[PDB]
Design an enzyme around this catalytic site. Sequence first.
Site: not given
Length: 283
Positions: A16-20, A133
């Site tokens: 994702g945009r967060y990383g992996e 979240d």
Amino acid sequence: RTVARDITLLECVGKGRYGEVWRGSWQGENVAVKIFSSRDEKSWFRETELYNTVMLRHENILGFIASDMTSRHSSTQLWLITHYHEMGSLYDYLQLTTLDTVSCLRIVLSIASGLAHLHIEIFGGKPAIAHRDLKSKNILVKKNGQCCIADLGLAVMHRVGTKRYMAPEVLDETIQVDCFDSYKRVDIWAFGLVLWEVARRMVSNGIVEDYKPPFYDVVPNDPSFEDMRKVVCVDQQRPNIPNRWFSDPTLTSLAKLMKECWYQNPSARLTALRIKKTLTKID
Ligand SMILES: COc1cc(-c2cncc(-c3ccc(C4CCN(C)CC4)cc3)c2C)cc(OC)c1OC
Ligand SMILES: COc1cc(-c2cncc(-c3ccc(C4CCN(C)CC4)cc3)c2C)cc(OC)c1OC
Ligand SMILES: COc1cc(-c2cncc(-c3ccc(C4CCN(C)CC4)cc3)c2C)cc(OC)c1OC
């Protein structure tokens, strides 16, 4: 002594945009390794700062193992290492699994238990924590049928939340930002949405709803802030309760509970501890 730090990264289970996130192996045991993007380095810092303040340990909170920062030639590599839950997220699980009464209640009471543990201040203990979240992708399913809450990268102790799950006071910017109870009440709204997502997958009288995310019928994919504000604040829409729930005592009780997580007035919403008590008296 030898300090074994090698983790074998075996398969990517999320990107994702967060990383992996990777399934990894340490000393023969599965671990989960979140590798942060530069985009999301502050989530690594915040979760690490929280765990350096209070080493949370609860059956319904994803288990912390380590925070690692490694110097590279021209960058810093940030890993969060946790327990690994091979069944994956609740979001994943609900796509292709239906539930009975016992499994549905066990799932939602375990989430309420994790959430109440975050929220409560314990003296002698832990600070009160709001998640900020909460959503079905941030809940993992365990083999014993309970869940655990994950991702404390936005948590606050006493990046914005996922817009689809934002409470009305976040969308209309009236939230009392100086008042810690405000953040608990935002988590309760999101919990109500998760409770709706799970309840839909509980079978009654041979009927079940397909998995859908909250507000699937009134906003686009990747809804804008404005899209959500018009639904939740201006028109004051709430997720649909299907007629078939009112034939089933468990889903009738869960509909009442989710309604009391979705009041426009944040201070009218149930607390996580009151949600737990109500869930223990269902069935
Ligand atoms: C640095 O980095 C990583 C370290 C480890 C890890 C590996 N072996 C042993 C250890 C260990 C734990 C605790 C003590 C204590 C013994 C009691 N005494 C009173 C104080 C010290 C010593 C050693 C660690 C912490 C794993 C890692 O990944 C899983 C690490 O990388 C994140
Ligand atoms: C980070 O995570 C893991 C770490 C370890 C691990 C490896 N070496 C040593 C330890 C250790 C030993 C002894 C103390 C002392 C503390 C003070 N007092 C004197 C009594 C007890 C603390 C720590 C641990 C905990 C194993 C793990 O799994 C089997 C870990 O989980 C992946
Ligand atoms: C939400 O957030 C975090 C989650 C996790 C985490 C922990 N256990 C297991 C997982 C996982 C494993 C496996 C699958 C798939 C693969 C096999 N099959 C085809 C379907 C299931 C999905 C998910 C994750 C993603 C770790 C985190 O940090 C290290 C997270 O961030 C805080």
